[PDB]
Design a protein around this ligand. Structure first.
Ligand code: ATP
Ligand code: ATP
Ligand code: K
Ligand code: K
Ligand code: MG
Ligand code: MG
Ligand code: MG
Ligand code: MG
Ligand code: MG
Ligand code: MG
Ligand code: MG
Ligand code: MG
Ligand code: ZN
Lengths: 49, 573
RNA sequence: UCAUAGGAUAUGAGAAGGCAGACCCGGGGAACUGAAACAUCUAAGUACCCGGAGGAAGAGAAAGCAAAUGCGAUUCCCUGAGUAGCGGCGAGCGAAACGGGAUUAGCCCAAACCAAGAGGCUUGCCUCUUGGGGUUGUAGGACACUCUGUACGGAGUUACAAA
RNA sequence: GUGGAUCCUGAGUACGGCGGAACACGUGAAAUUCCGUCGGAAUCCGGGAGGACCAUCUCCCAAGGCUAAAUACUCCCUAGU
RNA sequence: AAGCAGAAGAUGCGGAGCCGCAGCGAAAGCGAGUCUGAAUAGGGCGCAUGAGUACGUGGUCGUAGACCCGAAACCAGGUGA
RNA sequence: CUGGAAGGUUAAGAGGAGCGCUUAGCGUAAGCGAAGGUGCGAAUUGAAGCCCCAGUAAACGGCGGCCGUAACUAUAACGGU
RNA sequence: UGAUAUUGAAUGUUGGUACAGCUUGUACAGGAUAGGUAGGAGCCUUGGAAACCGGAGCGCCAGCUUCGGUGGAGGCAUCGGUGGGAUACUACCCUGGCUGUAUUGACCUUCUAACCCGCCGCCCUUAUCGGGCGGGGAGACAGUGUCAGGUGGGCAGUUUGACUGGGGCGGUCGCCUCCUAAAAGGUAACGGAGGCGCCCAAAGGUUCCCUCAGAAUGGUUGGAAAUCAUUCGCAGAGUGUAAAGGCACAAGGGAGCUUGACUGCGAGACCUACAAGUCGAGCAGGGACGAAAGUCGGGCUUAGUGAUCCGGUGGUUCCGCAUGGA
RNA sequence: GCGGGGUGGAGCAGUUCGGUAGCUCGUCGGGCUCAUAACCCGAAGGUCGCAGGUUCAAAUCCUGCCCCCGCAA
RNA sequence: GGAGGUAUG
């Protein structure tokens, strides 16, 4: 129901962040602009499948 | 060529929201397999097929298939494929496609306008969709819900063609009879787990019963064991408590004071406790080792067309009724009527105009010649053949359109009885399975306070429990029922009169669907009267001769007449 | 039936058994115990039983160690090192090569080929038996070519023949 | 000592599967060695090893045997501490 | 150190090897720095603020029965009707 | 326990679709890649047992609850579940 | 119980592989049983056309198929039409079925020479052992070896909790809040009360604005109590979730934009046997909100969790047992 | 104090997992019969022990309260 | 034409 997720940067693919979401409230792959340490800038991170 | 595995699925998992649809499915499709994928509505059959085809990516698992494999997919949203037919003409070798088409009964498809091609019968859509898939020369056929709208012709065609097909075929169907002719294996998808059965669908049914019976029996045996041991434990406990309680109160005053008295008795109590602990531990360990889960308790679809009051005799009359489309006459000078309580089956091949007439009766189509009278006081419920009527965006409640709490409660309660729970109600209809969409349309019918039921192909997209429940209910309904179905069994059970679409004429026949087909031309009906009377005399004389000894003088006269009458029988034949 | 088994006679410083409660090489092979329980593991290839022996036994003259302008049989001591590693990665188990030393020692066949002889004639082939020949690796040998000795000289009963 | 025409250079062997054991190394990425069972090479244009395995290179030539010294031990003998 | 000379000795020879003078890092590696890090930033561990080594005595610890005595048992090979 | 018959499930062993590593070669590179070797290997095949179906109790074993009812009452021959 | 070795021979049946032959091909229309593609105007013809008959297979009941006997000169086409497609004939192929050649197993019988005989006769031999020979029976099984599955208290090695007003039962075992707790902190009992093993994509951040509960009175449905309107009204409300401590320059309510529920860290502190746990200004990178100051490293604070070993996955200027890879 | 039960008149499901309140017998009304039974045709009878919450929806989930039955007592 | 046998009240 509420599960752990990992957000991968959409530029370099790196799984930079882990978080949780409630699957019933947010069933779709979440996206968040977060700092990617590899790219040294804020980039869109999308939940991995 | 061989039986090399063509499609191999392993550990296929797929979920939607929180609902697991497919849970750990391992199966292989080999060359020449004719597999029936069965299971009730919403079990995931279309979902599975789409994953096999590749329209939906699974959450876990691998799908192994030849990289070059061509997979012909009949799909459920024919509307999309048929709308692209104009585009398909440029991409497919015209010749082969049209060769098939004519066999399926779509004659001269070349000449159809884009209007007609957008106005097709649902049975025509399927016939056109089938011809397209087979002209593409696929190596693997997936046929989601075929024979739904097909007539006798298209079913004979689809059978004879499936048999010929060289590759494997996966058929998703609820039609017992179509499966009983084309498939040799059944994939039953229940509780998100696929079970395998050998043979056709009828034997699957039988074998499934036995598996359920065996499973049920075994579960009961285990439960009996558990209860036995719990009864033991309860008894031993009680004893242990009593033992400790009495440890200090036994014997006379002096004997109670003996040294070590209560310790002796309490030691005995401790032994009883050890038995309980051992019984418990063993029971727990045994369950962990082997704990059968309670067998599935199949849900029971329940819905009843509550009977209305009394109304009047006439409800429909047609005089010199003629319907045309541009220059094509659908039917001409066709007089018929329907009275209250008639159970009318509309019989006719695909495209003959069955659905057209219904739209005229409802008043959606006013473009006809003649008089078509309908009682103004007739409230009609109407399950439409075209499932795509409902906007596949609205939720179940929005499609019903009820706003007051009382109406909502009835609608929600009925939906729940039909197996659509809160989860599915709040979702856009576009997500519902094709049979779930049909249970939503049924609720819109039940919530109407009506007098007539028009059921246009009521057995497509419906599982055995829903079809069986519908059959029971419709047999009890005292109002008028008009049903179009090419499932002749369903028609033959429900309908007692027929409107036949033949040669651009609608004729009413006062007989059951089964009798009409098995008729035999009356070319010699003026002579059958003679054959009937003479033969009945033969029976009378033959009967008497059976009871009399040859030595009775009465025997001689009867034998002469018998031989003479037999000569007459020969002369008439 | 020839034969063979079997039987008889003669000839044998042939074997047998013992132990030195040790050492050596093998066939079989525990458990207590440790792991703070216990089964993988440990104890331990130990105790014990059995066989073969010898004054020693086993190993041994590279299908080796290594990664250098390399080394050059085996065995044992020092060291590597409680390292590398193995391990319910737990308890524990635990090297080897290089380097320094003791001691030093290398050889002989099978096969190709030659000669002789014999039996299967398998019929100009083959097998077996004698002697010669021959023994190794960026190859050696046979086989061809030369040179050379045939004891002048060398070795030896601890291998390299045997008293 | 010179030849590189031809011939010889250890076969149910090496090696492999399966089951065990020995290697410090408990199946592990497990090389190397040994056993039972089954299968089963090349043979000089050949073969083996350098810790799965392949390629290149380096080093050797298995499936025959013999070989003293340095080492281990003492029931016993002699002389002694 | 083994080992070779020597009274079963001292000693002489024997420099292989061992510890220390340099640390940081998992490692490549760099070095009074180094690792982390994008960073001449901060921080960790080090250096500047230094003494080790060989032998002997004593205290304690590890492996050995390990301060001494004591089971009921287990296992192996035998001896007894 | 005995006897069945198909079918389902199952091991070794047979089968080797395919995939990885290696590299002659192709190529400016990236990378692709024959053959051979090598590490994995799916389909198919593969018995008993089990599942399934019958029988067997001098086989192991087991051998119930609640409610009502008769012209004194009380109990129920009787009835319900 | 199966595979396999010991372990052989012949036959029959039935599948797979390769080849060859026999051939096999009906939507509708069209002259009718039109398999695909290619060339195609001549081809066949006493080397027997058509036609007659017999035989046979198939068959959609139209019919085509070929072994043939009578038969003796035509028969067929591109043209024509039909249709989606054209008819002869030839070249290369496919569907289906059939036969044969060669393999490949599985299975069926049968055989005899392996193996077996606790059968008979003879010899060794005064011998109920053993061995040899000759019959007979059985026979490729059995037995035995290797491997595998099932069964297996017949036998074997072991395991089968602690706290505790004795032990046992019951209860408890980790974490958060309060009281006991004696006005810092800490503080026990099987002392008194409860909660936790989450929840939120906004219920987080920022910018701006904002007050709550309750009562009286007035009001259509309307009722003690729904919505309004005035007066009184420190919190008598609310604060996701226990309790305590806080909160009205709000931490409570509403709205706009956003993702700081950031990356590297971290002076210095709290707590503490250790392992852990907690707080943290400030620095750098790149951002959200804001005009700016500035705030933001989740939530009013304090529960919502599990060492190591061992595995899975992603990244990687690391290592790679001669060398390059792996 | 510790457990189990309260569903039309009787005996029983359904409760875990919310979705039209049911099965057998009985009662009541009307037929058949001279009349009763059997039989045939219809109907009533519980809002699931009681009172509140949660929910669109509660016999079912939660909160309290009252009865019945077992033990201890 | 007659003999013998073969549910409640
Ligand atoms: N894309 C989707 N998103 C969410 N739910 C879905 C989606 N597709 C299917 N479902 C739901 O998951 C289940 C799968 O339905 P699915 O169409 O696969 O069944 P089906 O076997 O085809 O049934 P039917 O025969 O009734 O068509 C159903 O409950 C359906 O409502
Ligand atoms: N507007 C239209 N214009 C032209 N032709 C039409 C139009 N609507 C329908 N048709 C054709 O006329 C016939 C009428 O089809 P309709 O769906 O009404 O009946 P049906 O074939 O008997 O129904 P079913 O869908 O149940 O098989 C079909 O051939 C359809 O293609
Ligand atoms: K004895
Ligand atoms: K035991
Ligand atoms: Mg007593
Ligand atoms: Mg229609
Ligand atoms: Mg569907
Ligand atoms: Mg121990
Ligand atoms: Mg023990
Ligand atoms: Mg205790
Ligand atoms: Mg006590
Ligand atoms: Mg205090
Ligand atoms: Zn990035």
């Amino acid at each position: 129901m509420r599960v752990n997720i990992t957000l991968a940067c959409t530029e370099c693919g790196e799984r930079n962040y882990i978080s949780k979401k409630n699957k019933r409230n947010n069933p779709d792959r979440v996206e968040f602009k977060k700092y990617c340490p590899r790219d040294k800038k804020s980039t869109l991170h999308r939940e991995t499948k | 060529k061989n039986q090399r595995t063509i499609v191999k699925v392993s550990g296929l998992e797929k979920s939607f929201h929180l609902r697991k649809v497919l849970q750990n499915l391992h199966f292989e499709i080999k060359n020449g397999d004719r597999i029936g994928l069965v299971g009730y509505n919403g079990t995931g059959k279309t979902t599975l097929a789409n994953i096999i085809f590749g329209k939906i990516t699974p959450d876990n698992g691998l799908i192994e298939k030849s990289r070059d494999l061509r997979m012909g997919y009949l799909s459920q949203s024919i509307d999309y494929e048929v709308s692209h037919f104009q585009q398909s003409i440029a991409e497919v070798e015209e010749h082969e496609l049209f060769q098939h088409a004519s066999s399926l009964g779509l004659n001269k498809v070349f000449d159809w306008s884009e209007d007609r091609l957008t106005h097709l019968s649902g049975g025509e859509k399927l016939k056109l969709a089938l011809s397209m898939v087979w002209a593409t020369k696929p190596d693997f056929l997936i046929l989601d819900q075929p024979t739904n709208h097909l007539d006798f012709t298209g079913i004979n065609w689809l059978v004879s063609e499936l048999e010929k097909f060289h590759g494997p075929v996966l058929i998703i169907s609820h039609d017992r009879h179509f499966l009983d002719k084309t498939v040799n294996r059944i994939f039953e998808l229940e509780e998100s787990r696929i079970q395998f059965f050998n043979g056709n669908y009828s034997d699957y049914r039988i074998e499934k019963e036995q598996r359920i019976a065996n499973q049920r029996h075994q579960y009961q045996v285990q439960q009996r064991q558990i209860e036995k041991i719990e009864t033991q434990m309860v008894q031993l406990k009680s004893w242990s408590e009593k033992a400790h309680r009495d440890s200090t109160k036994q014997g006379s005053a002096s004997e109670r004071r003996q040294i070590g008295f209560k310790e002796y008795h309490r030691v005995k109590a401790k032994k009883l406790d050890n038995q309980v602990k051992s019984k418990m531990k063993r029971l727990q360990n045994e369950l962990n080792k082997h704990k059968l889960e309670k067998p599935n308790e199949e849900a029971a679809v329940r819905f009843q067309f509550d009977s209305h009051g009394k109304r009047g005799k006439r409800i429909i009359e047609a005089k010199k009724l003629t319907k045309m489309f541009d220059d094509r006459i659908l039917f001409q000078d066709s007089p018929f009527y329907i009275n209250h309580g008639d159970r009318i089956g509309l019989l006719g091949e695909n495209g003959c105009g069955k659905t057209t007439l219904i739209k005229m009766i409802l008043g959606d189509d006013l473009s006809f010649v003649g008089e078509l009278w309908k009682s103004d006081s007739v409230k009609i419920a109407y399950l439409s053949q075209d499932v795509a009527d409902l906007s596949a965006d609205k939720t179940a409640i929005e499609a019903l359109g009820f706003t007051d709490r009382e109406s909502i409660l009835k609608a929600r309660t009925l939906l729940a009885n039909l197996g659509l729970k809160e989860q599915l109600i709040t979702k856009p209809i576009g997500t519902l399975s094709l049979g779930e969409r049909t249970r939503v349309k049924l609720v819109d019918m039940l919530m109407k306070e009506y007098d007539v039921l028009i059921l246009d192909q009521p057995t497509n997209h419906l599982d055995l429990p829903s079809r069986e429940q519908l059959e029971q209910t419709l047999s009890e309904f005292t109002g008028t029922i008009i049903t179009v179905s090419h499932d002749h069994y369903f028609l033959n059970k429900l309908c007692d009169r027929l409107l036949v679409f033949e040669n651009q004429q609608i004729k009413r026949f006062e007989m059951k669907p089964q009798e009409y087909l098995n008729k035999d031309v009356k070319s010699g009906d003026r002579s059958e009267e003679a054959m009937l009377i003479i033969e009945n005399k033969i029976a009378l004389i033959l009967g008497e001769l059976s009871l009399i000894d040859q030595n009775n003088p009465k025997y001689y006269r009867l034998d002469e007449e018998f031989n003479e009458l037999l000569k007459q029988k020969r002369n008439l034949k």
